[PDB]
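User: Structure with manganese (II) ion, C-alpha coordinates only please.
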Amino acid sequence: RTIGIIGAPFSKGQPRGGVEEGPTVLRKAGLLEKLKEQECDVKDYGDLPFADIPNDSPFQIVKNPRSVGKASEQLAGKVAEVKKNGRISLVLGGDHSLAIGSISGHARVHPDLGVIWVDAHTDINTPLTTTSGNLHGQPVSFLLKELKGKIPDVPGFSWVTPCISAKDIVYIGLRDVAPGEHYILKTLGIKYFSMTEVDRLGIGKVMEETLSYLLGRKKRPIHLSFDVDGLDPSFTPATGTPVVGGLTYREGLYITEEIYKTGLLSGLDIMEVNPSLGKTPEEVTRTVNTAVAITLACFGLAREGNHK
Ligand SMILES: N[C@@H](CCCC[B-](O)(O)O)C(=O)O
Ligand SMILES: [Mn+2]
Ligand SMILES: [Mn+2]
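Assistant:
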Protein backbone atom coordinates (compact mmCIF):
# COMPACT_ATOMS: atom_id res chain seq x y z
CA ARG A 1 0.00 0.00 0.00
CA THR A 2 2.64 2.53 -1.11
CA ILE A 3 1.58 6.17 -1.36
CA GLY A 4 2.11 8.71 -4.11
CA ILE A 5 1.15 12.16 -2.81
CA ILE A 6 -0.08 14.27 -5.72
CA GLY A 7 -0.99 17.90 -5.04
CA ALA A 8 -3.57 19.61 -7.29
CA PRO A 9 -3.87 23.31 -6.26
CA PHE A 10 -6.69 23.94 -8.68
CA SER A 11 -9.87 25.98 -8.27
CA LYS A 12 -11.36 27.12 -11.61
CA GLY A 13 -14.08 24.49 -11.23
CA GLN A 14 -16.25 26.75 -9.04
CA PRO A 15 -16.42 30.46 -7.94
CA ARG A 16 -14.65 30.75 -4.56
CA GLY A 17 -10.91 30.31 -5.13
CA GLY A 18 -9.07 29.46 -1.90
CA VAL A 19 -9.63 25.77 -2.56
CA GLU A 20 -6.39 25.52 -4.52
CA GLU A 21 -4.51 26.47 -1.37
CA GLY A 22 -5.59 23.17 0.14
CA PRO A 23 -2.66 20.85 -0.64
CA THR A 24 -0.98 23.38 1.62
CA VAL A 25 -3.16 23.33 4.76
CA LEU A 26 -3.20 19.52 4.58
CA ARG A 27 0.51 19.14 3.80
CA LYS A 28 1.34 21.61 6.58
CA ALA A 29 -1.23 20.12 8.96
CA GLY A 30 1.14 17.16 8.94
CA LEU A 31 -0.32 14.79 6.29
CA LEU A 32 2.76 13.27 4.61
CA GLU A 33 4.56 13.30 7.98
CA LYS A 34 1.76 11.58 9.96
CA LEU A 35 1.61 9.01 7.14
CA LYS A 36 5.22 8.12 7.99
CA GLU A 37 4.35 7.29 11.64
CA GLN A 38 2.46 4.48 9.93
CA GLU A 39 4.29 1.78 7.93
CA CYS A 40 3.63 4.01 4.90
CA ASP A 41 6.14 4.38 2.04
CA VAL A 42 5.54 7.98 0.94
CA LYS A 43 6.86 9.82 -2.14
CA ASP A 44 5.53 13.36 -2.71
CA TYR A 45 5.31 14.22 -6.39
CA GLY A 46 4.98 17.83 -5.27
CA ASP A 47 2.23 20.29 -6.14
CA LEU A 48 1.10 20.33 -9.80
CA PRO A 49 1.60 23.82 -11.31
CA PHE A 50 -1.58 24.61 -13.24
CA ALA A 51 -0.60 27.54 -15.46
CA ASP A 52 -3.57 29.79 -16.14
CA ILE A 53 -5.44 30.17 -19.39
CA PRO A 54 -6.19 33.93 -19.71
CA ASN A 55 -8.43 33.40 -22.71
CA ASP A 56 -11.17 31.07 -21.40
CA SER A 57 -14.65 32.44 -22.29
CA PRO A 58 -17.73 30.44 -21.23
CA PHE A 59 -18.73 27.56 -23.52
CA GLN A 60 -22.48 28.06 -23.38
CA ILE A 61 -22.70 28.59 -19.60
CA VAL A 62 -19.87 26.18 -18.77
CA LYS A 63 -17.18 28.13 -16.88
CA ASN A 64 -13.38 27.88 -17.32
CA PRO A 65 -13.71 24.75 -19.49
CA ARG A 66 -10.22 24.91 -21.01
CA SER A 67 -8.61 25.79 -17.67
CA VAL A 68 -10.44 22.85 -16.08
CA GLY A 69 -9.95 20.43 -18.98
CA LYS A 70 -6.22 21.13 -19.05
CA ALA A 71 -5.63 20.81 -15.30
CA SER A 72 -7.53 17.51 -15.34
CA GLU A 73 -5.61 16.35 -18.39
CA GLN A 74 -2.44 17.41 -16.57
CA LEU A 75 -3.36 15.38 -13.49
CA ALA A 76 -4.46 12.36 -15.57
CA GLY A 77 -0.93 11.76 -16.82
CA LYS A 78 0.58 12.48 -13.42
CA VAL A 79 -1.72 9.99 -11.71
CA ALA A 80 -1.14 7.41 -14.46
CA GLU A 81 2.52 7.97 -13.67
CA VAL A 82 2.44 7.19 -9.92
CA LYS A 83 0.12 4.29 -10.70
CA LYS A 84 2.65 2.89 -13.17
CA ASN A 85 5.02 2.99 -10.18
CA GLY A 86 3.15 0.53 -7.95
CA ARG A 87 1.84 3.34 -5.79
CA ILE A 88 -1.59 4.48 -4.61
CA SER A 89 -2.22 7.98 -5.92
CA LEU A 90 -3.07 10.54 -3.23
CA VAL A 91 -4.65 13.58 -4.83
CA LEU A 92 -4.69 16.50 -2.41
CA GLY A 93 -6.88 18.71 -4.54
CA GLY A 94 -8.56 22.00 -5.07
CA ASP A 95 -12.03 21.50 -6.49
CA HIS A 96 -13.71 18.22 -7.40
CA SER A 97 -13.48 18.77 -11.18
CA LEU A 98 -10.00 17.26 -10.85
CA ALA A 99 -11.71 13.89 -10.47
CA ILE A 100 -12.13 13.93 -14.25
CA GLY A 101 -8.36 13.76 -14.63
CA SER A 102 -7.94 11.76 -11.43
CA ILE A 103 -10.16 8.77 -12.19
CA SER A 104 -9.28 9.06 -15.91
CA GLY A 105 -5.53 8.51 -15.51
CA HIS A 106 -6.09 5.80 -12.91
CA ALA A 107 -8.12 3.85 -15.47
CA ARG A 108 -5.27 4.11 -18.00
CA VAL A 109 -3.14 1.88 -15.79
CA HIS A 110 -6.17 0.14 -14.21
CA PRO A 111 -9.27 0.03 -16.48
CA ASP A 112 -11.13 -2.37 -14.13
CA LEU A 113 -11.32 0.05 -11.18
CA GLY A 114 -14.48 0.70 -9.20
CA VAL A 115 -15.29 4.17 -7.97
CA ILE A 116 -16.52 4.98 -4.46
CA TRP A 117 -17.78 8.60 -4.37
CA VAL A 118 -18.34 10.10 -0.87
CA ASP A 119 -20.32 13.39 -1.37
CA ALA A 120 -23.50 15.34 -0.51
CA HIS A 121 -23.94 15.86 -4.26
CA THR A 122 -23.87 13.37 -7.15
CA ASP A 123 -21.83 15.76 -9.32
CA ILE A 124 -23.31 14.19 -12.45
CA ASN A 125 -24.43 17.29 -14.37
CA THR A 126 -23.89 17.23 -18.14
CA PRO A 127 -22.95 20.54 -19.77
CA LEU A 128 -26.69 20.66 -20.56
CA THR A 129 -28.17 19.70 -17.20
CA THR A 130 -26.11 21.99 -14.97
CA THR A 131 -27.56 25.44 -14.16
CA SER A 132 -24.48 27.04 -12.58
CA GLY A 133 -21.72 26.24 -15.08
CA ASN A 134 -19.34 25.24 -12.28
CA LEU A 135 -17.47 22.24 -13.71
CA HIS A 136 -17.01 20.80 -10.17
CA GLY A 137 -20.55 19.44 -10.29
CA GLN A 138 -20.16 17.71 -13.66
CA PRO A 139 -17.05 15.46 -13.28
CA VAL A 140 -18.92 12.14 -13.13
CA SER A 141 -20.65 13.47 -16.25
CA PHE A 142 -17.46 13.36 -18.37
CA LEU A 143 -16.43 9.97 -16.90
CA LEU A 144 -19.38 7.65 -17.71
CA LYS A 145 -19.62 5.61 -20.90
CA GLU A 146 -23.43 5.47 -20.96
CA LEU A 147 -23.60 9.24 -21.19
CA LYS A 148 -20.96 9.88 -23.86
CA GLY A 149 -23.09 10.97 -26.80
CA LYS A 150 -24.96 13.16 -24.29
CA ILE A 151 -21.79 15.04 -23.29
CA PRO A 152 -21.09 17.91 -25.71
CA ASP A 153 -17.68 19.07 -26.87
CA VAL A 154 -16.58 21.38 -24.05
CA PRO A 155 -13.29 23.03 -25.11
CA GLY A 156 -10.34 21.61 -23.16
CA PHE A 157 -11.58 18.06 -22.59
CA SER A 158 -10.91 16.42 -26.01
CA TRP A 159 -8.34 14.32 -24.16
CA VAL A 160 -11.14 12.71 -22.13
CA THR A 161 -12.80 9.40 -22.89
CA PRO A 162 -15.45 7.75 -20.66
CA CYS A 163 -13.56 5.19 -18.53
CA ILE A 164 -16.20 3.75 -16.18
CA SER A 165 -19.71 2.33 -16.46
CA ALA A 166 -22.71 3.39 -14.37
CA LYS A 167 -22.32 0.01 -12.68
CA ASP A 168 -18.71 0.61 -11.58
CA ILE A 169 -19.60 3.48 -9.23
CA VAL A 170 -21.45 3.86 -5.91
CA TYR A 171 -22.51 7.08 -4.07
CA ILE A 172 -22.53 7.45 -0.24
CA GLY A 173 -23.90 10.49 1.59
CA LEU A 174 -26.19 12.16 -0.96
CA ARG A 175 -28.53 14.89 0.34
CA ASP A 176 -28.45 17.67 -2.28
CA VAL A 177 -29.19 16.21 -5.73
CA ALA A 178 -30.57 18.29 -8.63
CA PRO A 179 -33.58 17.11 -10.74
CA GLY A 180 -31.38 16.60 -13.81
CA GLU A 181 -28.93 14.57 -11.76
CA HIS A 182 -31.61 12.37 -10.10
CA TYR A 183 -33.03 11.38 -13.52
CA ILE A 184 -29.52 10.34 -14.70
CA LEU A 185 -29.20 8.46 -11.41
CA LYS A 186 -32.41 6.50 -11.86
CA THR A 187 -32.06 6.21 -15.66
CA LEU A 188 -28.53 4.78 -15.82
CA GLY A 189 -29.32 2.76 -12.69
CA ILE A 190 -26.46 4.11 -10.61
CA LYS A 191 -26.22 2.38 -7.24
CA TYR A 192 -26.13 4.96 -4.46
CA PHE A 193 -26.70 5.37 -0.71
CA SER A 194 -28.06 8.84 0.04
CA MET A 195 -28.36 10.00 3.64
CA THR A 196 -31.80 8.29 3.74
CA GLU A 197 -30.21 4.84 3.24
CA VAL A 198 -27.43 5.46 5.77
CA ASP A 199 -30.21 6.38 8.21
CA ARG A 200 -32.23 3.25 7.36
CA LEU A 201 -29.34 0.80 7.10
CA GLY A 202 -26.65 2.26 9.31
CA ILE A 203 -23.22 2.91 7.78
CA GLY A 204 -22.21 -0.63 8.73
CA LYS A 205 -24.63 -2.25 6.26
CA VAL A 206 -24.20 0.68 3.84
CA MET A 207 -20.50 -0.20 3.60
CA GLU A 208 -21.12 -3.97 3.49
CA GLU A 209 -23.24 -3.64 0.34
CA THR A 210 -21.13 -0.96 -1.35
CA LEU A 211 -17.96 -3.10 -1.35
CA SER A 212 -19.94 -6.23 -2.22
CA TYR A 213 -21.43 -4.32 -5.13
CA LEU A 214 -17.88 -3.52 -6.24
CA LEU A 215 -15.80 -6.61 -5.42
CA GLY A 216 -18.45 -9.31 -5.72
CA ARG A 217 -17.14 -11.04 -8.85
CA LYS A 218 -13.50 -9.89 -8.76
CA LYS A 219 -11.26 -8.13 -6.25
CA ARG A 220 -10.80 -5.07 -8.49
CA PRO A 221 -9.10 -1.70 -7.79
CA ILE A 222 -11.05 0.87 -5.78
CA HIS A 223 -11.00 4.63 -6.47
CA LEU A 224 -12.17 6.64 -3.46
CA SER A 225 -13.07 10.20 -4.49
CA PHE A 226 -13.71 11.83 -1.13
CA ASP A 227 -15.43 15.24 -0.99
CA VAL A 228 -15.23 16.71 2.53
CA ASP A 229 -18.72 18.17 2.14
CA GLY A 230 -20.11 14.65 2.31
CA LEU A 231 -19.35 14.97 6.01
CA ASP A 232 -21.69 17.23 8.01
CA PRO A 233 -20.65 20.93 8.12
CA SER A 234 -20.02 20.62 11.88
CA PHE A 235 -16.87 18.67 11.02
CA THR A 236 -15.67 20.13 7.73
CA PRO A 237 -17.21 23.65 7.55
CA ALA A 238 -14.43 25.24 5.47
CA THR A 239 -15.99 24.00 2.23
CA GLY A 240 -17.76 25.61 -0.77
CA THR A 241 -21.15 23.87 -0.79
CA PRO A 242 -22.06 22.64 2.73
CA VAL A 243 -25.36 20.82 3.44
CA VAL A 244 -26.79 19.84 6.84
CA GLY A 245 -27.60 16.26 7.78
CA GLY A 246 -24.33 14.81 6.59
CA LEU A 247 -22.02 11.90 7.33
CA THR A 248 -20.60 12.02 10.84
CA TYR A 249 -16.94 12.15 11.84
CA ARG A 250 -17.28 8.51 12.87
CA GLU A 251 -19.09 7.50 9.64
CA GLY A 252 -16.38 9.40 7.79
CA LEU A 253 -13.83 7.21 9.60
CA TYR A 254 -15.90 4.04 9.27
CA ILE A 255 -16.29 4.34 5.50
CA THR A 256 -12.51 4.64 5.08
CA GLU A 257 -11.42 2.16 7.78
CA GLU A 258 -13.43 -0.47 5.94
CA ILE A 259 -12.22 0.51 2.46
CA TYR A 260 -8.60 0.31 3.58
CA LYS A 261 -9.13 -3.17 5.01
CA THR A 262 -9.89 -4.47 1.50
CA GLY A 263 -6.25 -3.88 0.66
CA LEU A 264 -7.64 -2.73 -2.68
CA LEU A 265 -7.32 1.02 -2.23
CA SER A 266 -5.69 2.15 -5.46
CA GLY A 267 -6.58 5.80 -5.95
CA LEU A 268 -7.87 8.48 -3.59
CA ASP A 269 -9.10 12.07 -3.79
CA ILE A 270 -9.40 14.45 -0.87
CA MET A 271 -11.28 17.38 -2.45
CA GLU A 272 -13.00 20.69 -1.69
CA VAL A 273 -11.20 21.81 1.47
CA ASN A 274 -11.20 25.62 1.53
CA PRO A 275 -9.53 27.28 4.58
CA SER A 276 -10.68 30.78 3.62
CA LEU A 277 -14.28 29.64 3.93
CA GLY A 278 -13.73 29.01 7.62
CA LYS A 279 -15.55 31.82 9.39
CA THR A 280 -13.13 31.42 12.32
CA PRO A 281 -9.63 30.09 12.94
CA GLU A 282 -10.77 26.82 14.52
CA GLU A 283 -13.19 26.19 11.67
CA VAL A 284 -10.28 25.81 9.26
CA THR A 285 -8.31 23.49 11.54
CA ARG A 286 -11.39 21.38 12.25
CA THR A 287 -11.92 20.91 8.47
CA VAL A 288 -8.26 20.15 7.78
CA ASN A 289 -8.00 17.88 10.84
CA THR A 290 -11.10 15.88 9.80
CA ALA A 291 -9.53 15.71 6.34
CA VAL A 292 -6.19 14.40 7.72
CA ALA A 293 -7.96 11.69 9.77
CA ILE A 294 -9.97 10.49 6.76
CA THR A 295 -6.66 10.17 4.88
CA LEU A 296 -4.86 8.30 7.68
CA ALA A 297 -7.72 5.85 7.99
CA CYS A 298 -7.51 5.17 4.26
CA PHE A 299 -3.99 4.01 4.93
CA GLY A 300 -4.27 1.87 8.02
CA LEU A 301 -4.86 4.10 11.04
CA ALA A 302 -7.42 2.10 13.00
CA ARG A 303 -9.53 3.47 15.89
CA GLU A 304 -9.02 0.19 17.79
CA GLY A 305 -5.27 0.65 17.72
CA ASN A 306 -2.26 -0.34 15.63
CA HIS A 307 0.85 -2.33 16.58
CA LYS A 308 4.12 -3.07 14.77
N1 LIG B 1 -25.26 20.66 -8.54
C1 LIG B 1 -24.69 21.97 -8.11
C2 LIG B 1 -23.72 21.75 -6.90
C3 LIG B 1 -22.38 21.10 -7.21
C4 LIG B 1 -21.65 20.54 -6.00
C5 LIG B 1 -20.23 20.09 -6.36
B1 LIG B 1 -19.35 19.46 -5.21
O1 LIG B 1 -19.72 18.09 -4.97
O2 LIG B 1 -17.96 19.44 -5.62
O3 LIG B 1 -19.42 20.16 -3.94
C6 LIG B 1 -23.94 22.53 -9.35
O4 LIG B 1 -24.03 21.69 -10.41
O5 LIG B 1 -23.35 23.57 -9.40
MN1 LIG C 1 -18.06 16.90 -5.20
MN1 LIG D 1 -20.22 18.11 -2.79
